Amino acid sequence: VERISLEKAALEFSEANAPHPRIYELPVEEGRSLLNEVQDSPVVKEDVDIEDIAVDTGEWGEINVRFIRPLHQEKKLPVIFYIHGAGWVFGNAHTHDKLIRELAVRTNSVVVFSEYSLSPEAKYPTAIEQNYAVLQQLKDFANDKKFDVNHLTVAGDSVGGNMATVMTLLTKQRGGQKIGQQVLYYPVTDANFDTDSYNEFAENYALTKEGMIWFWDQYTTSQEERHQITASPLRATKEDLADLPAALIITGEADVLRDEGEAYARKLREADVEVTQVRFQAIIHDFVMVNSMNETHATRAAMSLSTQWINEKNRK
Amino acid sequence: VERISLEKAALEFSEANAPHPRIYELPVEEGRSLLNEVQDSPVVKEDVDIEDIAVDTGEWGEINVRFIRPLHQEKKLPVIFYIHGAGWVFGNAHTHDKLIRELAVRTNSVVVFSEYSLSPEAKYPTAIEQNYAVLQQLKDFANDKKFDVNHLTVAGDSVGGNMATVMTLLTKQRGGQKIGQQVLYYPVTDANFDTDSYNEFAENYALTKEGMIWFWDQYTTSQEERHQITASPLRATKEDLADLPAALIITGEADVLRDEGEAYARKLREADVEVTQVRFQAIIHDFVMVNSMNETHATRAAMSLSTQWINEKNR
């Protein structure tokens, strides 16, 4: 029961995820249902136009891609390619609904939300190849979905932050659709479970060290995989990271992933990438996604900073 | 020579302040001139209308208070009472010119800037009593200076953030002019020099543990005074802190004062005060004030977050 200072909704969400069996101790089908039920909880939602489109990723099959648009926009908007978190095992358009609607409206952008194949049914690198392939097709939707592919932000939370920063790496390496900038909400950057934040916040803050070990076990078959920079971008060299797009990296104080996210920000800064890195106090993992944490000072400030930072980038 | 990852301009500012004699080893007159010269360095400043008004604080004497207004504005604007940092010993309208012009123009506010008596010529609690007395005369200037006291933010950097929050303790204790919100940039909150941030960043990050000990020594050297909540607001109890105005507290990573800023945020939170606490990576002390740090990612994001937070509170 001894916690560091937390906002009330973060304490409450930490207590509601203390009991066993925990999400990661359930059969995956019950895990997915449980998070859908958490994200059934009441929240003020921005009103938007939604279209679901089947996209062909070539070798990695067909996935649903959801297009979010703010109401009554007559001009071509900037585009955010958004990659959802929840461990590679959970998540869909419903679990991240409030968050992508707020992004869409406050940045006056089209949000392209890829429903990539979840682990463990699909293994690394399916999801990152599926995401990179719908990125290379944004140009073919731009006209019909009234967005400008030249004003392209990639964004993600947790494992989506992981895969969003990895889209910039694949994009530089293979010469894909130019990404202007990247927004990473408490990303996964490394398969190391022994950072200072990983030990301090191991238990009692909803997401656990054991939770993260299990997610990664669902994600990879092996370990010569977790060393690859498209799995663990924290392992990239200064040369790998050179010329990558401008980054906004948001961490929570009470988060096992805090230190690897802050570590990654430093590597990008040391490779001369423009980096804005900001740690919100008294907040846990998943704080911009979870409906019940929507009115936290951390969620309000992180949403204001991220939308202002994206708006500034798009003004150009 | 070994430092954590810093933004280029923060590393440059840290290197420029490495030699002896330090600003705090100079006679105070020379330190004041040196910081004036640092803040002559080039910066694009927002355009404003400026009036300097001699205000009488009674017991603590007459000080200059600078009134800053955005151009071409006819309506009653909200007001920010801005208390400047630089250790109680340095600083003036010029050393903080870019920051207060940015705050005025981006919030479309009148900024009221008190040139309170500096230490060690003046001792605690003269500066806090002068600032409190100016807060109570805002109503007297509202009509001529076309602002609305009902939309009143108090803000300050470093010892200014110290004194801004103390403005909220005093206004509560004394029932003075109501303050809606407080913005604290990397505030001083306590006279303990052994926090982990005080020890990690003691040297090589421009502001030193040595410099902060010297600033405190110019202000008051009584342990009893340093322990009053009007000096070290971090010593405030839950009951002292209850019903205080909503707080934005901004810290930099590579700052001796980071830990006490972040601990003050916690105590407000525990008093059920509405607190937004945010730490910027790879930046030093004084990052929203110093002209050469103006284009830092930390400064741009801190000014965008603080200005929007103020606008959202006044709506």
Residue numbers in the entry:
A (entry chain G): 2 to 317
B (entry chain A): 2 to 316
What sentences appear in the manuscript?
In this study, we performed an in-depth biochemical and structural characterization of a novel microbial acetylesterase, LgEstI, from the bacterial fish pathogen Lactococcus garvieae. LgEstI belongs to the HSL family of α/β-hydrolases and presents a clear substrate preference for a short acyl chain and an acetate moiety that are suitable for the narrow entrance to the active site. Monomeric LgEstI exhibits a canonical α/β hydrolase fold with conserved key active site residues. The active site of LgEstI has the typical catalytic triad of esterases, identified as Ser159, Asp256, and His286, and is located at the bottom of the substrate access channel.
